[model samples]
Target: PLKVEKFATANRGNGLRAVTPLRPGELLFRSDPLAYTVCKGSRGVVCDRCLLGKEKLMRCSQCRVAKYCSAKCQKKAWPDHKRECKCLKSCKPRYPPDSVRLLGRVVFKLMDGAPSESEKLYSFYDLESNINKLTEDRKEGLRQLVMTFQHFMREEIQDASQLPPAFDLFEAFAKVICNSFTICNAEMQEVGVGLYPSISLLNHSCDPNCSIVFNGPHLLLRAVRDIEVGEELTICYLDMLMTSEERRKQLRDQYCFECDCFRCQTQDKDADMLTGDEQVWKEVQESLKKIEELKAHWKWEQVLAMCQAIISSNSERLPDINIYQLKVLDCAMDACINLGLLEEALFYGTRTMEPYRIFFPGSHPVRGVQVMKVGKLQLHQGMFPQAMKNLRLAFDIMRVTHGREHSLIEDLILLLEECDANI
Candidate 1:
């Protein structure tokens, strides 16, 4: 049921609050996207319309772009892709980047019919551009996108005639940049991007009360924690694991604002503070890069060795909560998993659990997966009671974030059943 009440805030511009008390895991609202585009990496494997992954995919014969799983999908996607399909053809061997394609879709939709009244919490026109806050570099980036868009659609129509009446391309571009959401799939992998004007009303909080999950192109906002009536519903715009400084810089650079959320204002600074030696920090970073190359070659043994060398040499300098240490530990754990060293993998995984808890509080998906991994490792080690404990904790959080019907939940259910028989 619809529960959000929108109003103006003294500082953060527009804000939304719960009209009634909200329970944990409650579905706050869901919205169909204004316009959406599949990410370049996900183009062929996933259908552009529904985001379903199928063994066989079809491509638009005319543009030689835009893949779909079925004819029905292509038919449904025709409106959004109609203009872009021609523009895409013009781009030829050099396909327009994802941002330009997304911008084109938004412009096309606006020209056709900019929905104003029905289901109106906010409209694309109502969305803030935050143009004045744009740093010189970011403005340059936007300028390049505008240039590329013009180039991309040159053959289709003149830029002036293609635009919606009285629409400022710069302002529309700014709004799209500010308001778009990365549409991540059920496994938390980003598959596409979409603009959801209604859902954009919820402001940012470092420790947010709401969780956002996607079901295809549709957006679902769920309560990650209980909230009293009139409390503002918030979501984090950046990764929660970053230090306050890193997070603040990112928010300023991208979103054009400083965060003073609960976690930002009064967090345990030590957890994010990096007291590690400079040499050790560089070593960790280099090792991480090396690990990536090693992983590309499926060299699990070398990855494990590199991870261990860093961890053992710099354990004292690098606090367990330090992000670099966490990264190394995560890599080490995965390397062990790949090498079939279950007990050792569980060892590294168990250490990361507390820091994961500290960084990712509430019904966050990353924390849920980490807990599931630890539980699964424990199950293989015959630690039934411990496995059950962690699995149940994961189950509760994931049921809210991933929903009970997800394939992940089914796997978790099977694991829980395994624990049931053992205990």
Candidate 2:
């Protein structure tokens, strides 16, 4: 489903670029998982074949390691589960941690599957693991996983003759698991993990032009900004809500690379560039220090004045996507709510709704919380029906995302009843 072609890049090594000019919201590419597994705790709760759906999971009789809703799901899952069945049986009641279990899943698939070029073993093998770049201490942790892998392999595979000289599959699994995407429910809570081979081709950019949305096992990357023909399609690998310095450090520490992307080059200055002056940014930062001082002394009026000034002056000046905007807007929203300014809280809440959707195309938890905040404001305004509507949306998304049995849902359920009474 791509409007893009992936090829060698002069600057960033391998990358994907638009094949034709693409408008914002254009579907660029899509991928299905190379292999997937429900995380350890979710095994019996969700269908093993179609992961997102829930069913009365019937645990496989042989290994009891796999579960499914019906014989049809069982039949579909059996092929993959069969290979791992003996290994799990031999490993006894002990199961590997989710990471290692997933790692074991992929390796067994590689060993049992035809050839790398035939199915997908090769692509999984090709992913960068940064083993050589790993810190010595981290490498030591992988060594422990390696020993565990060796133990499982001996119990499962009859062919000691086929073993590699080093037998250090630790590097491969470590790299793949690190690169793998967390599979989330529609409400955007992590339920499982998967490796999407084609999705791996796109490189990281803090200032990405693409947004990702999921459809069960499929990953669809959509352009979030217009792109000319042959422009590289990049996506964020770090939290857009974090300062660039924090983002850069995490990327380096976690992924073993530094980004020199345009946003990272100037960072807050990038937002300031939109503000039409570096002085606006300078004042923004300087005011934050004073705001912190006011907060420490519990000067509510002084803190509110400082936050309001920055938000009012820079609301339009700030880039639509800057972390500075979210930080300040969130502060303003909190101050408005605590000061009982229901109408003002709604105004500040307006700025964040779309940004949350853009940042997490799959419907993030923050977006759900923002809607609930709006619902809370509506309640204060005596708009019962409107309050019920937003609160219902929040409740529906949060229940599935957080799980129905948790205290988060317990509170949401109570809130829903209150909204019902008011209506």
Candidate 3:
């Protein structure tokens, strides 16, 4: 059973912290597919065709993603199907099942309920305004309401993909789009959105010492730096990782809040930190920024320095690192292996895995890659047994979470075979 204990962190936000003090590297929490459904937004109740619930329904022959209680339901839903049916076909390969679940949740919200005039208008206003200008104090409250509206909309509708062409549905859909802006804005206000329910409870901070990790639907909050038990755990809502002006603008437009965190408050003192006067710190930030630019480009060489800089900078700063930082670290670790920086790669790889394990415990889809990476690194270092162990665990987790046919599964299998042969 997952043990959840609510406590107050330095951010003055309530969160469910681990009862046990999590070590530098520890498994935190894993989400159970049964307890939580990807049903919050437009994707709550699944059609009988996709899940186990509705056997009597007829499924679409075209894409096979949608199920109907009858041919009548299918025909009734066709008007809204203008893009959805096609999207189902095209998006299937690129998106994982969980991605579809998230989409469904969002769509479900749009279809679920009718929005009040105030809700609709507020959502509209939020969309039209520049997100960077919002005040921090008001940001969370608005976000909460918008998210609540999103939930309401998702819960009100019976079938999302088949929503009627009523003007109200259109209005509700508009609200959803606006609400999405609110979510993005909130993330902009804080640091990277931490794990879901846990992050939802964390208040915003400018110079937060914690960071968030997204593992599918679950979010994990981890300490970037060492702290006493009573200290607050926080993540920078805006770009704490970026320079001051960039951070300020991001906060103004997205969060509609002003940042007054330590970084912003002590701008002059931190000026040297950004200018490379702080040697190691400057290198870390620069490397991280470069890795961000190279992410889609998949430039591994650039990432190695970035990950190393992060590790060298100190684990205490771990919580302050953003999502982009984590991505760079992962990419750098992989790149190091390609460059035959085995010793260094193993070192950083182990460090990177620490937070991931805490953020997403076991068997998450995202965990598969990290686990496999660790396995490969171990294998490279001639730790064949350890490598095989990690690889096998990764393979098992992938198979369970993604099913055997997933491309990730195929990759894991190939790796597993390679590990076996090497051993």
Candidate 4:
């Protein structure tokens, strides 16, 4: 683990930076949720406690609003659910959206007992509102959310007295949620949302230096590249894979800022920065949406088929290095690996490396993962020369990216020994 220290930024406000140099893939910090809410739509499908996805689960008999995969999960979740049960029952059969669900959790956390250690630095009260910057249309939409929050509170909250004052409280949620919280349970999966007051101190960059992952309810931030002491830690506010225009638009619309991060600052002035004709890119984009939905549902074979079709169709119109092509290739690699189709996995995996190299230059955490996967496959195929070369390359990169003690590096070392003996 790496030591992280928070300090105020002149232009960026409160921010965290490495107290010491952080090797790639080293854990910088871990934080448990101050508050979390399972998305309303995920009820009956995701465990309310662990946030894991499942085919079926038991719903709480009293409220019928919460579900869990097992008795263990249900018992674990009840402390939080007990407070929410009555209000949800009153609103029965129709639950709140994720945003409202999160706001509810935030309110509950604030009202509960004493302030936690994290809250001492910046309580939900002190979260940057940026409220005045919101245009009138946005404010009106937030006002509707506040009205929903206020109504939910009226049923259960003693403080409301059925009539709340201004939206000062709810507006804080609207202002910070876009920039403050992360929906968890999986990467790109939104089974639930979490607010870690400490994690919120990290700022945004299009090319971030670290990655966030959840282990149960804990939020773990890991270095994606070696970060130097005193460097302000950053994470992408928008998908880093997005084209510059899309990334900028998302930042502005979702969080109300224009990023001037490393990648954003250097990207071409026009959308032409991304290759392919508009119509072709449009088709690829639509296909990718379908692919994502299929992947989300764990239809691995369908993902495999769609990935191949998209790759084949777009290969003629787009370069291998194009983000869309690389993404499809990434899907193909994962689907093939999960299905144990090593030959096919190697094909897509090999194709993925060059694009990863082009996009994620020196010692990127993702590029390291891809190279390790590819090297492992070569070992399985008994291609010792390629295995040795790739695994050695993986060792150098993964040591920095995943750190020296990672199981990945140990496996690389063992595999190198195997290849040497075989030769």
Q: How many Å off is the CA of 287 in candidate 2?
A: 28
- For TM-score, the strongest prediction is 1
Q: Residue 382: error of model 2 in Å?
A: 12
For every model shown, what is its TM-score relative to the native structure?
A: 0.82, 0.63, 0.38, 0.79
User: For residues 1-423, could you state the per-residue lDDT of candidate 3 as single tens digits?
Assistant: 432344655433344444444433223333211112222211212332222223255667776766655666567556444344565565554322322233344343345535422222122222223334345654564465445433433433334345534423333323232223111111111111111322333345654444443333233445433434444444455432355676777656544456676656766333422432344444455666566555433455766666656655554443323434454566666677767888877776776665566444434445656687788778767888788988998776555444433344576787788879987
Candidate 2 or 3, higher lDDT? 2
- lDDT (CA) for every model shown? 0.81, 0.66, 0.47, 0.71
Q: What ranking of all candidate models by lDDT puts the best one first?
A: 1, 4, 2, 3
TM-score of 4: 0.79
For residues 1-423, write the lDDT of model 1, one tens digit per residue: 579988898899998899999987777877888788998767776899998777789999989789999999999898778888988887888887777888788777777855723226887778888998998898888888888888987776586777877777677778877788888766455678888888888889887889887878877788888899889999878766567877878788778998876667875454464556667766776677788566544567998999888777735457677777887887788789868999999999999999888778778977887789899999998899999999999998888876753567788999999898999
Between 1 and 4, whose lDDT is larger? 1
RMSD per prediction, one decimal? Answer: 4.1, 11.0, 12.8, 4.4
lDDT, model 3, position 160: 37
Off by over 4 Å in 4: 19-26, 39-45, 53-56, 117-120, 151-154, 158-167, 183-191, 224-229, 268-273, 297-308, 314-317, 332-346, 362-423
Candidate 4 or 1, higher TM-score: 1
- lDDT winner: 1
